[PDB]
Design an enzyme around this catalytic site. Sequence first.
Site, short mmCIF file in Angstrom:
data_model
loop_
_atom_site.label_atom_id
_atom_site.label_comp_id
_atom_site.label_asym_id
_atom_site.label_seq_id
_atom_site.Cartn_x
_atom_site.Cartn_y
_atom_site.Cartn_z
N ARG A 54 0.82 -1.18 0.09
CA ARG A 54 -0.13 0.09 0.20
C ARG A 54 0.92 1.14 0.02
O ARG A 54 0.49 2.32 -0.47
CB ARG A 54 -0.87 -0.08 1.20
CG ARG A 54 -2.21 0.90 1.17
CD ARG A 54 -2.73 1.16 2.40
NE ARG A 54 -1.84 1.60 3.24
CZ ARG A 54 -1.74 1.55 4.67
NH1 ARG A 54 -2.35 0.20 5.12
NH2 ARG A 54 -0.74 1.99 5.27
N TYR A 84 -17.21 16.39 -14.53
CA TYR A 84 -17.73 15.20 -14.66
C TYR A 84 -18.78 15.02 -13.25
O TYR A 84 -18.33 15.40 -12.36
CB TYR A 84 -16.80 14.09 -14.57
CG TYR A 84 -17.12 12.79 -14.18
CD1 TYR A 84 -17.74 12.08 -14.85
CD2 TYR A 84 -16.44 12.07 -12.96
CE1 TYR A 84 -18.53 10.74 -14.77
CE2 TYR A 84 -16.96 11.01 -12.50
CZ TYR A 84 -17.81 10.19 -13.61
OH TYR A 84 -18.22 8.92 -13.12
N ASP A 109 -8.06 17.80 -15.72
CA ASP A 109 -8.39 16.08 -16.14
C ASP A 109 -8.02 16.14 -17.60
O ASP A 109 -9.08 16.65 -18.31
CB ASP A 109 -9.78 15.98 -15.81
CG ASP A 109 -10.38 14.66 -16.15
OD1 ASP A 109 -9.70 13.94 -17.00
OD2 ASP A 109 -11.63 14.39 -15.82
N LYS A 161 -10.55 4.58 -19.01
CA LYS A 161 -10.95 4.88 -20.22
C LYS A 161 -9.86 4.51 -21.45
O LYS A 161 -9.56 3.50 -21.50
CB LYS A 161 -11.33 6.36 -20.42
CG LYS A 161 -12.81 6.69 -19.66
CD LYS A 161 -12.74 6.29 -18.32
CE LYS A 161 -14.30 6.20 -17.89
NZ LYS A 161 -14.75 7.63 -17.97
#
Lengths: 365, 373, 365
Positions: free
Chosen positions: B40, B92, B164, B189
């Site tokens: 992590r 978004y 973005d 995407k």
Amino acid sequence: MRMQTKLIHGGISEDATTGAVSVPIYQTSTYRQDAIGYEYSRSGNPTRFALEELIADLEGGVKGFAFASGLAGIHAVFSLLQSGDHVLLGDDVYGGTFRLFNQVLVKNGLSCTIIDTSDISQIKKAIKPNTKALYLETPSNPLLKITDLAQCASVAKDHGLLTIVDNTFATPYYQNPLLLGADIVAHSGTKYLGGHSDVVAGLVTTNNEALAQEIAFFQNAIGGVLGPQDSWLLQRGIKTLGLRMEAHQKNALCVAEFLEKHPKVERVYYPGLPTHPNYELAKKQMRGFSGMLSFTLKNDSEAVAFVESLKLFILGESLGGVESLVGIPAFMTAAGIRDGLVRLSVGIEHEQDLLEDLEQAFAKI
Amino acid sequence: MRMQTKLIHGGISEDATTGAVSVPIYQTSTYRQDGYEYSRSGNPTRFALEELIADLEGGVKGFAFASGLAGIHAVFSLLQSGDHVLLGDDVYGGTFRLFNQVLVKNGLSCTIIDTSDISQIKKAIKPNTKALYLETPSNPLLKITDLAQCASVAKDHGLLTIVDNTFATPYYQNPLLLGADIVAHSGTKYLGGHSDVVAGLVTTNNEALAQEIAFFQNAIGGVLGPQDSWLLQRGIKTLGLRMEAHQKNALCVAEFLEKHPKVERVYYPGLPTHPNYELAKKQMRGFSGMLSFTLKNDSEAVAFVESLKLFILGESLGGVESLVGIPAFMTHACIPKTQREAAGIRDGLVRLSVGIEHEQDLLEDLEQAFAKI
Amino acid sequence: MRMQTKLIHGGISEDATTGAVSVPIYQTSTYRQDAIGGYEYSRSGNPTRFALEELIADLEGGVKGFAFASGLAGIHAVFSLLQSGDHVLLGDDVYGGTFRLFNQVLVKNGLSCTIIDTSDISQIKKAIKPNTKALYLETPSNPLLKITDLAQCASVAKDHGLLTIVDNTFATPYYQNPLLLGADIVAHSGTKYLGGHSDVVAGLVTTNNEALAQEIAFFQNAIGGVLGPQDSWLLQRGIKTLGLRMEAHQKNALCVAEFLEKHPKVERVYYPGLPTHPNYELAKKQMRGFSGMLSFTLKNDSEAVAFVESLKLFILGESLGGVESLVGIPAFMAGIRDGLVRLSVGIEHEQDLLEDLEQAFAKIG
Ligand SMILES: *Cc1c(COP(=O)(O)O)cnc(C)c1O
């Protein structure tokens, strides 16, 4: 799939395990468990769940909820509010919804304001600081007044408000409040949804995950749930909704245009007439007008006579079945509501016979 | 090496010890000690991808997240309560939701502005504004924002430019080379490209910002697993070829659609008639596979989409498969109708993620759908 | 200098050169210069008018005063600061002619307005547009004496880019000082309480703000709706007894309010001095007193005219704020019922006023 295929294959329409092309009727109250830790038919029933998935599916909701009656649904919705909460209401809402507020929700800390919902400024004028919800009903009973859903839901959303829409008259087949900005849709399934004047039911669905648990909770905690037999009958009825609404509308348009051109008749109230206030708005938010029309005749005393001389039309206390119903709101369910106002629920009979029953009745006054 | 070569050999694309031309998937949570300690905090599969994205966007460090939203969350975790952020009006829905439903409750604030209008951002700056979130081209109206301008203005106030860059990938647009401080991607995407991975990517110009992002990646724990890291990296290797094909297809489709009698307006940055086409050409080396178009009759948009048989009716975008949605009934159903029209989103707006299928098969699918309305 | 003293020696109350205890009346249009390069032209400046303007600035706590041909001409000039395409909030019961100023004059010049209840501070918040520039308050309000919180509305307007404009005609500078409560512009109809003698038509406007002063000056001069020297002087003269008149007005108005309230024949009574009045605690806080203005609606609504036409002392006339008692039905001359009687309580003996009312009541059913 499209709307009319959805009416048939939507929600849950088949039994997974057996292939049965209908959902089995689950007359059970309890289910065996397989470890300590469906559990109870007040909280979960496969026959009701199928129906609930179907209404969610038709309105574009995330969950459906089935109630013992339309009012059990509406009640369960308003149960989301605390005492001291304020609600805005249409001025000609269904009599039982107003009664609900007046004599049940008030005694428990809710307040209201009766406004004209087609007057978007009136709603603005009435928002209090403790207002939490806006309750809309379009088209309206019994004047069939049209309310701009998108705009109300817009005014409502930029204030912290809830848009609640009783969508009974125009069915999910003709209007979809959730796709216009509304948060919660409520139906009387007693009427158009089952369609055969043989089931008493209520249906609620919603856009919103959080509201969904809220409704879920009070459906189960207050316990106003629809039975499996009724659920199954309602879903069965929903399968022919498209066909029934088309015919309702065809017949209603024929009757509306018959009464409008008739000497003994003064005003006709029907969303499908171009001379109807807000006809343009109706066409923009509805894909069709239903079977509901009221009309008022010139000689106002002759109302009772007219209704009573109808043979085919049935003098009864509800609406939205395959059989035509006739009514006078004044003596059944001031504000447009002259006492000489006759409300027809136009059914799915032959239009010639429906026109002939109206002829013979006028020919007696 | 040039961008196209960098997709294959950049960041870490090779196992140094074994020679393997593919980084191994370290499905491990811990490491023996006598430079990794906990997966992590650091994992060699994730690190390789992280180096790659930093290397492509010209950053110092990359950070792979469990999801695009997770990354955008880590970025905004930089700001203290009291801080104020400027958001694009075509943000978004999930980014808008982050602020509306998560970050606000934590003490942030925003103002919504059209970022294609530079004076609007100036009018909106408060003494306590710390950031500006940009997204170009936009979803679903594909509206362009001058990166250099906005970065500069933001810099000459005390502002971090956060971009973005999902739609126009690092293959066509590099915000950091145009004054942006932080670039965020939904790896879900175009970067992954095969609609088979959910991932966020975040990179930065600034060493100090990088320590901040690194700390929040680790402390909040929304990291990307080693399998997905590897999958995302594999996808990226064809980013160049795929984008070329996306754009080819998209241009062809856009051009088809405006020849079309039933279609009214087409929104695509590669069209000369597109507002800010010249600006587009300045800051982008190409245009994506993303387009929408509005048809003359609104109620015909449902039937059009329903009769499609190649385009998949779906929620996502940027995969090798073509995707179609109606933003008003899917990605934006919650928003009141009259507000959607206010924001240019008609019920007749149709969004296409133009995939990499044969352009003719894509066009023949569009013809038959029109033919049926 | 206290307000009571300030009314007598404030602004300019003495001719500097001659020592005259009264300001001389400059019936002049022009002045000799030793130019090229004090007074040039009476539209730009007149020593008599200026004396009055200085007095009002001094009374309301302003930096400059402005005397106009009427209360309306002043209000006009104030709103003349705004470009076309700007927006303004208006009280739902501002002065009849202040509405008719917006409705028919300033709108067609590219101005926009929204009628709101200003005593509902949340209502003003709900109406702010991006192009809105000013809020216009009027408290107590004509003719219902509805009270608005000047301090809060100012604040709400101040944290937005808005101008607070207050019509202070009713509660004069002697009872209320809006400029100290966060207002930017105060306006009076001098025709009313300031003149006190029902013999001068005038308007007074003052401001806290240097830059606003430059602007109002510019528009007073450019439109030229200026007050004459004789009217200014008469106005100043009137203002000298303001304190004494306001005390008698209140003493009488409270005495009448309590008569009308305890009266069987009367329904509601509107007076900020009555404990049982909406926002009575608000009145006490921002006002140092209640004036001579009160209205009341009687139980028999159709017998409003008969009442008014049988009053012998009170004068049926078209104004307010005079030493003689005035009465009018504001409807013939949203709260306003066609039987609402408005009383302008004068400074005559209260026993004579009450005995005029007794005799008038004793002629209706
Ligand atoms: C009839 C009706 C109801 C009542 O449903 P019940 O089944 O009577 O509970 C609720 N809403 C509307 C609009 C109705 O018409």
